[PDB]
Design a protein around this ligand. Structure first.
Ligand SMILES: Nc1nc2c(ncn2[C@@H]2O[C@H](COP(=O)(O)OP(=O)(O)O)[C@@H](O)[C@H]2O)c(=O)[nH]1
Ligand SMILES: Nc1nc2c(ncn2[C@@H]2O[C@H](COP(=O)(O)OP(=O)(O)O)[C@@H](O)[C@H]2O)c(=O)[nH]1
Lengths: 420, 96, 53, 420
């Protein structure tokens, strides 16, 4: 079934704008939305088919008090995305309240696309955590979607924000988002601003314009995570089959990301596989262990190398994991596209369930716990107090995320057979 | 996934006494599967047939179709009839 | 019109349906060629009345 | 037999003026009606033949309190339509009374053409519902025609008016027109001002001059609805032969429209069919379902593709009839004309009996019911009161249209075998 992407918030709208542009050039598409003449791939899932080959992405763009939003509209690709479905604070509470009054028109825009498609399998959100308007509005829309569309499976390309710690309420906003995400997301793929900023400092000298350049890094991961779905394959063609292996227990649905070519701008599989297990290529910042690992390689890979390669990574043990889940690394292979350059034709990515990401969740919980005692930034803005007089959703969120922090470490232990 | 999918809903659901072996349903699903594949509609798609060999008395518990004799049959042109021997395509069926 | 017309119509309706189901059944036995039966009930009206044997 | 079109009222006279002009260029005719030197069609039905190839269509132009009709006369096409048959309020009652005094001279103008033609098969009215002068005069002339030609059949290109709701009596005028139209019209083809205005906003930026541009949209549908008759074919070479399939029960004789390329300014048959069933291509604004669908395609269409196209549509199920009968999508095919542009080499239209149109009838019945209680606009004009002192034709109309509203929903039910 076709996938509908609910890109929301200024930050989320920036990475959806680029992700669709990335699949414009990668696929046989043009800024008008029509196919290029020069142009064997499965464009049905991601791109709606118009009568005159105007393959329009099924993007849902949500904006709130737009000013810099108009920049997406003044672009050569404005015609490419024309489902004609765009509808008009820095606080999590401020975003949640604004979403509630406009919920029905934004929800009808969801319906239109659902009716238009032959079918709808999942809602992929370009979510921004502690995103000012992006968070709060995104949590609320996350709660409505599961109730209305229980059958579908949701994913979140959460850009978890770590900038070395401006938002003084950033921990409070993030704390609330996770309680909803844990509760109302079937899957989440985690990314980190600092981890990518550190990569940007590593591969390039770019430091001050970190957000503009890092957009390309988030994009390469995003296009890559779905390339097996976008291009024809003998296995995991459906999104669901892919999702099951990466998330073995429902609560632990957060996925770590890595790219074998930190710089993609021959190499045998035995090599490309080993790079994913080096921490310099990872993009995320008591014993600790992965729960299950998966990898997808691109290009005309030599296959015999993989049997040697898979048995080879095994002797290397570069990846240390002994979870409750069996955790064999899974090997996938896909075709690099026939439009984009063949430089570094072989290039890989890995998506894995790792207990280390628990540490990133605890750090915002640490900032929040410190901030909660001080009550330095309760906002006490009338919106914040009137929306939350008890201020007990933050405590409800704190116990739910602490259960998550606890569950992760329970995964490390030998007995996750018992309740976690 | 599709040719197997429609059949599975029916096989598990009921019609278990070879009511899923109606030549009409078999042909209907096959054409449906071929059309909906999206890899393509081609002169090559011709010679594709959905068929059966051993006849099931009834489908068993768990609807296993553990040896269900549904034979995909492929016709071959005179010259390549020599190149592709009947025994050879007999083997091809096994993986299916 | 209420009764006499209906009396003529019911016998013709049964006879036409009898001459119609026997025909679609005797055409269903054969193996483009089957696009004949598929098109005749494109909605699924009288999708199947009497299963033969 | 030749078709005589009784175009009446300023709005109706505007769409007949254009429809005849559209068939002027499409057929081999110049603005003086002369056979074009540059020029395979059946012109006998729509165009009378003069000895010097003067193709004067059998148009009957009725002008009441003329203003627009003065402009039709100052046109290059004034010579093209010269049967020399044009004869001299905003209330339905005001229009009906004016028609009654001049009924015999307008009716003799009908006779002249009937005598002149080898034969006469149907009267096609460019009717305007709640058209001020156009309604009331049109209802009265609708009643006279059936009595005089009991064997003959009357069609109505009703431009049902929906402008988001100026006429304060608009619901009252429309209410009366339908009662006459339900019992005294063999067929009706429904169009909607808002539905077309929404299409105008969609395909173009035109908003303020909605009436002038929408005339072209009503015309393309009108020329197209007759192209199977105007050009010879294997089947659908008589109006009546075509009318039967579209109207299965006499009461439900209202027909919905659609055009696959609203932006007509290659495409396989499988594509042009699927595009049409989508609701953006439709031009009309409890379970609901079609009673029977039909489609006609004019372009470079492969013949064997169409029978495969029908099978593909059956699988797509984009629309399901689910009626009491064997109603099936019916594929029909015609020749696009030479001389005029062949853009959108393949381009289609659909005419269908749909129970959704009941909702549009109920909305004017809703405005009227609300208006009837208030009695805000009883007119009480002496014409209105003297013509209708009892004001019970409105109630007679209300029960007849309510029977129609009821009959439609009965069609949706499994038992229309029982009385509806
Ligand atoms: N990855 C990425 N993150 C961004 C970018 N711009 C802003 N952000 C993140 O967006 C978050 C704040 O959201 P914000 O821009 O305030 O949303 P707003 O309230 O709509 O302005 C911060 O956590 C930033 O890390 C960008 O270009 N790339
Ligand atoms: N489709 C279409 N409808 C029109 C146009 N002009 C007027 N109408 C309709 O005509 C109706 C009113 O008729 P009107 O023009 O008042 O007739 P008059 O009394 O002769 O002026 C309204 O319901 C309008 O929707 C036009 O150019 N196109």
């Amino acid at each position: 079934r076709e996938i509908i992407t609910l890109q929301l918030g200024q930050c989320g709208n920036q990475i959806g704008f680029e992700f669709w542009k990335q699949l414009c050039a990668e696929h046989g598409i043009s800024p008008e939305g029509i196919v290029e003449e020069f142009a064997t791939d499965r464009k049905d899932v991601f791109f709606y088919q118009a009568d005159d080959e105007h393959y329009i992405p099924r993007a849902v763009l949500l904006d709130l008090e737009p000013r810099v939003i108009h920049s997406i509209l003044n672009s050569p690709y404005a015609k490419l995305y024309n489902p004609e479905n765009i509808y008009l604070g820095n606080n999590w509470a401020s975003g949640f309240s604004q979403g509630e009054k406009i919920h029905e028109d934004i929800f009808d825009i969801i319906d239109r696309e659902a009716d238009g498609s032959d079918s709808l399998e999942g809602f992929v959100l370009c979510h921004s955590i502690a995103g000012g308007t992006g968070s709060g509005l995104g949590s609320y829309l996350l709660e409505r979607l599961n109730d209305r569309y229980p059958k579908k499976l949701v994913q979140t390309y959460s850009v978890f924000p770590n900038q070395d710690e401006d938002v003084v309420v950033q921990p409070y906003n993030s704390l609330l988002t996770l309680k909803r995400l844990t509760q109302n997301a079937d899957c989440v793929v985690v990314l980190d601003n600092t981890a990518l900023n550190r990569i940007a400092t590593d591969r390039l000298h770019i430091q001050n314009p970190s957000f503009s350049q890092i957009n390309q890094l988030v994009s390469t991961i995003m296009s890559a995570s779905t390339t097996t779905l976008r291009y024809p394959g003998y296995m995991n063609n459906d999104l669901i089959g892919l999702i099951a292996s990466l998330i073995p227990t429902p609560r632990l649905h957060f996925l770590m990301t890595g790219y074998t070519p930190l710089t993609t701008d021959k190499t045998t599989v035995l090599d490309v596989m080993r790079r994913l297990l080096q921490p310099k290529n990872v993009m995320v910042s008591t014993n600790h262990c992965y729960i299950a690992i998966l990898n997808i390689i691109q290009g005309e890979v030599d296959p015999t190398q993989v049997h040697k390669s898979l048995q080879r990574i095994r002797e290397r043990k570069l990846a240390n994991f002994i979870p409750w889940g069996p955790a064999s690394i899974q090997v996938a292979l896909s075709r690099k596209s026939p439009y984009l350059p063949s430089a570094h034709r072989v290039s890989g990515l890995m998506m894995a369930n790792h207990t280390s990401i628990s540490s990133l969740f605890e750090r915002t919980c640490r900032q929040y716990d410190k901030l909660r005692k001080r009550e330095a930034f309760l906002e006490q803005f009338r919106k914040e107090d009137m929306f939350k007089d008890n201020f007990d959703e933050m405590d409800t969120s704190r116990e739910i995320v602490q259960q998550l922090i606890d569950e992760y470490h329970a995964a490390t232990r030998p007995d996750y057979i018992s309740w976690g | 996934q599709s040719l197997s999918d429609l059949l599975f809903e029916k096989l598990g659901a009921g019609q278990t006494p070879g009511e899923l072996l109606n030549p009409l349903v078999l042909n209907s699903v096959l054409s449906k599967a071929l059309q909906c594949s999206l890899h393509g509609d081609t002169p090559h798609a011709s010679n594709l047939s959905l068929a059966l060999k051993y006849l099931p008395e009834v489908f068993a518990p768990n609807a296993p179709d553990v040896l269900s004799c549904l034979e995909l049959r492929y016709k071959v042109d005179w010259p390549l009839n020599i190149v592709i021997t009947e025994g050879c395509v007999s083997k091809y069926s096994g993986v299916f | 019109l209420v009764s006499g017309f209906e009396a003529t119509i019911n016998k013709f309706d049964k006879n036409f349906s009898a001459h119609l189901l026997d025909l679609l059944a005797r055409l269903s036995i054969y193996s483009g060629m089957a696009s004949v039966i598929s098109r005749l009930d494109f909605n699924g009206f009288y999708t199947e009345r009497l299963e033969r044997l």
